């Protein structure tokens, strides 16, 4: 079977080829291709990728930030990696709740989004509503009820769970590869808390870009071949999802090739 | 290039080998897959299935149904396709309004989801939000802010507009086909509207899923080839989506395999 990693280097190779030039909001050019999936298995293996080195101190140190609801900067920089306002946090921990400030207490104040998808995951396996969503805090004054940024949908069968990602807009070069091992990591942390195995992770884009500036970098990582996924080791038996704690997981195996910086 | 029907046809093969037995909210059983996408090119012809006969009177009187906002059974059954709640109608025109009654008058009441995009369209065609989202009515009274069943991300490039709708689950052998018209034929109503040319639909599943008795019917579709997918044309020049009539569309060169009834 072929490696994961070359869906993300052939869709980067697609952009490059058929992507239409298209602005972002600032203004700031993009090769972009509307509509695109891929399937990363979890089984035995962890997605985090090789053709370059992934942050991953970020993304198991950002992902438990957001776990904890925070919406303070500080407690996230301070690991080593300020009211931000209702960041993804404050959404999946306090959805619907008025935000006051990184002080205040919203205990339960508004739907615990993530809580309740590991609930519905424990009263009914079947269900094909255990969904998730965010917003970019942007967009919230800006109008009426409006549109999520992403959203999750998890899925259960055979004692394996499994999610997909979808995102309006995904920045193939600087978020996409962090953001595979970012719910990759989310799916095996509440599987783990499920008593189920990690199954596969589907990441869906609405609109897939890549930034002028980043396309030099990427035509040299596409000159680049995946080595074996790494895999992911939880070395505590963990309850609650507000439970864990950094020093829990264990990336074994991975040796990627030279960090590659996006501008 | 392959016909665009193929990717149905390998997806319903892909079920049927590879699917997982998974039950509904009846219990009724089906084989499953998690994450599913196809696309289909709206340039220059329709993706009206051709290995079975689409009812594309359904399809064409239900969308119309649900532009108009309506949620009385009886204006749909009459066009030869009762209070029925807060259905798709309502949710697409009248967003957030509380739902009283068929009759109620809800004019600028809640936030109407299509004038939107069609609005988001011609002000801003970059826009990585223009999102319409649906619900099962079902849904609403069971839990606070419940995920949708369904939403639609708009794109736009070169003038020409394409369409992505993400379902979190899809019946393979009823509603995926009379779905795959329906939205492809939204689309070219909107482009038409906004002076753009239909580009591209994106179809994208949670739970792709086949009920048990399908099966042996689409074991049996799979046998049949394809045929040049038809052209739709728009004879009249429309300017509001609300003045859309049955008589303004016409399929063209549509000669489908027979009718395959699916329980």
């Given at each position: 079977?072929?490696?994961?990693?070359?869906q993300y280097?052939?869709?980067?190779?697609?952009?490059?080829?058929c992507?239409?030039r298209?602005?972002?909001?600032?203004?700031?050019?993009?090769?972009?291709?509307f509509?695109?999936?891929?399937?990363?298995?979890?089984?035995?293996?962890?997605?985090?990728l090789?053709?370059?080195?992934v942050?991953?101190?970020?993304?198991?140190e950002?992902?438990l930030?957001?776990?904890?609801?925070?919406?303070n900067?500080?407690?996230?920089?301070s690991?080593?990696?300020?009211?931000?306002?209702?960041?993804?946090?404050?959404?999946?921990?306090?959805?619907?709740?008025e935000?006051?400030?990184?002080?205040?207490?919203?205990?339960?104040?508004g739907?615990?989004?993530?809580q309740?998808?590991?609930?519905?995951?424990?009263?009914?396996?079947?269900?094909?509503?255990?969904?998730?969503?965010?917003?970019?805090?942007?967009?919230?004054p800006?109008?009426?009820?409006?549109?999520?940024?992403?959203?999750?949908?998890?899925?259960?069968?055979?004692?394996?769970?499994?999610?997909?990602?979808?995102?309006?807009?995904?920045?193939?070069?600087?978020?996409?590869?962090?953001?595979?091992?970012?719910y990759?990591?989310l799916?095996?942390?509440?599987?783990?808390?499920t008593?189920?195995?990690p199954?596969?992770?589907?990441?869906?884009?609405?609109?897939?870009?890549?930034?002028?500036?980043?396309?030099?970098?990427?035509k040299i990582?596409?000159?680049?071949e995946?080595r074996?996924?790494?895999?992911?080791?939880?070395?505590?038996?963990?309850?609650?999802?507000?439970?864990?704690?950094?020093?829990?997981f264990?990336?074994?195996?991975?040796?990627?090739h030279?960090?590659?910086?996006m501008?």
């Amino acid at each position: 079977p072929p490696h994961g990693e070359l869906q993300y280097l052939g869709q980067i190779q697609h952009i490059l080829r058929c992507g239409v030039r298209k602005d972002d909001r600032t203004g700031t050019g993009t090769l972009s291709v509307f509509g695109m999936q891929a399937r990363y298995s979890l089984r035995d293996e962890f997605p985090l990728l090789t053709t370059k080195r992934v942050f991953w101190k970020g993304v198991l140190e950002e992902l438990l930030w957001f776990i904890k609801g925070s919406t303070n900067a500080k407690e996230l920089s301070s690991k080593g990696v300020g009211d931000l306002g209702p960041v993804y946090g404050f959404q999946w921990r306090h959805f619907g709740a008025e935000y006051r400030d990184m002080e205040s207490d919203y205990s339960g104040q508004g739907v615990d989004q993530l809580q309740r998808v590991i609930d519905t995951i424990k009263t009914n396996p079947d269900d094909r509503r255990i969904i998730m969503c965010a917003w970019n805090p942007r967009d919230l004054p800006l109008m009426a009820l409006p549109p999520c940024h992403a959203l999750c949908q998890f899925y259960v069968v055979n004692s394996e769970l499994s999610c997909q990602l979808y995102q309006r807009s995904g920045d193939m070069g600087l978020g996409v590869p962090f953001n595979i091992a970012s719910y990759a990591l989310l799916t095996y942390m509440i599987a783990h808390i499920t008593g189920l195995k990690p199954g596969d992770f589907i990441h869906t884009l609405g609109d897939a870009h890549i930034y002028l500036n980043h396309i030099e970098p990427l035509k040299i990582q596409l000159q680049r071949e995946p080595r074996p996924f790494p895999k992911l080791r939880i070395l505590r038996k963990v309850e609650k999802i507000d439970d864990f704690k950094a020093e829990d997981f264990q990336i074994e195996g991975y040796n990627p090739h030279p960090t590659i910086k996006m501008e």
